[PDB]
């Protein structure tokens, strides 16, 4: 429905399905459809060098997860609009859900992810 919630669900559905022992979504050229370009370029650099920030997956904020369970339990809350930036809470998993905050911006007709936040204290 062209909403930021829908853009979030789509992205993660696609993400988890391209996160395996054979491929990783950041390596996929389709990542630029969902994530802002400069955010991709920065994350690729991060991953190739020191590795993923805080040593967890940047998009999912975990090291490890059951692909099947998460794929069936992606739960979004309605976005909070902070100016032109939509902040979408997303919960993963059927038990003890992981919570992330997805930041999106309108680029052309689309919502593009520009940042993803965990709920951890200031590091």
């Amino acid at each position: 429905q062209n909403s930021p919630e829908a853009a979030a669900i789509s992205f993660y559905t696609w993400f988890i399905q391209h996160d395996s022992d054979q491929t990783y979504p950041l390596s996929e050229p389709d990542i630029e459809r969902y994530v802002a370009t400069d955010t991709v370029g920065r994350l690729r650099n991060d991953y190739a060098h020191a590795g993923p920030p805080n040593g967890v997956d940047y998009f999912l904020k975990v090291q490890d997860y059951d692909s099947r369970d998460w794929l069936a339990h992606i739960q979004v809350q309605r976005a909070l609009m902070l100016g032109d930036v939509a902040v979408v809470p997303v919960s993963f998993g059927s038990q003890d859900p992981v919570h992330v905050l997805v930041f999106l911006k309108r680029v052309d007709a689309t919502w593009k992810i520009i940042k993803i936040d965990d709920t951890w204290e200031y590091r």
């Binding site: 996160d19 395996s20 022992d21 491929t23 990783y24 950041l26 390596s27 991953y47 190739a48 060098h49 020191a50 590795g51 993923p52 040593g55 967890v56 997956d57 940047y58 999912l60 090291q63 490890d64 997860y65 059951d66 692909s67």
Partner: protein, 118 residues
């Protein structure tokens, strides 16, 4: 030697998360099965120790007891190793996602080999 029993051991003795000892946890399980491997400090270097103990390199779909040795990835310069329990790879923790123990690994896709005893 019972590769199955080694796998069963590893499954039973996991930590809730990585504690930075994939190699020791897998070595200890293999010891439970009946084989004492020559020690080496980093997971990436366990290949020679495995061949010396009678394992051979395996290619294809994994079987229970199969042992994987994975080369380094960004922020993980020592590599990784794990043993297959029949449905999950088991290192010092139970790996829900696959043999790569994390996103640094899935992203970089370092080389790996699987070892099997006969």
């Amino acid at each position: 030697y019972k590769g199955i029993s080694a796998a069963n051991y590893a499954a039973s003795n996991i930590e809730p998360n990585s504690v930075g000892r994939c190699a020791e946890y897998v070595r200890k399980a293999i010891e439970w099965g009946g084989i004492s491997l020559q020690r080496t400090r980093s997971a990436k270097d366990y290949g020679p120790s495995l061949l010396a103990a009678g394992f051979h390199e395996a290619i294809g779909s994994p079987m229970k007891g199969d042992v994987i040795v994975i080369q380094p990835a960004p922020g993980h310069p020592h590599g990784h190793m794990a043993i297959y329990d029949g449905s999950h790879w088991i290192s010092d923790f139970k790996q829900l996602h696959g043999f790569y123990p994390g996103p640094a690994y899935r992203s970089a896709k370092p080389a790996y080999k699987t070892y099997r005893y006969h």
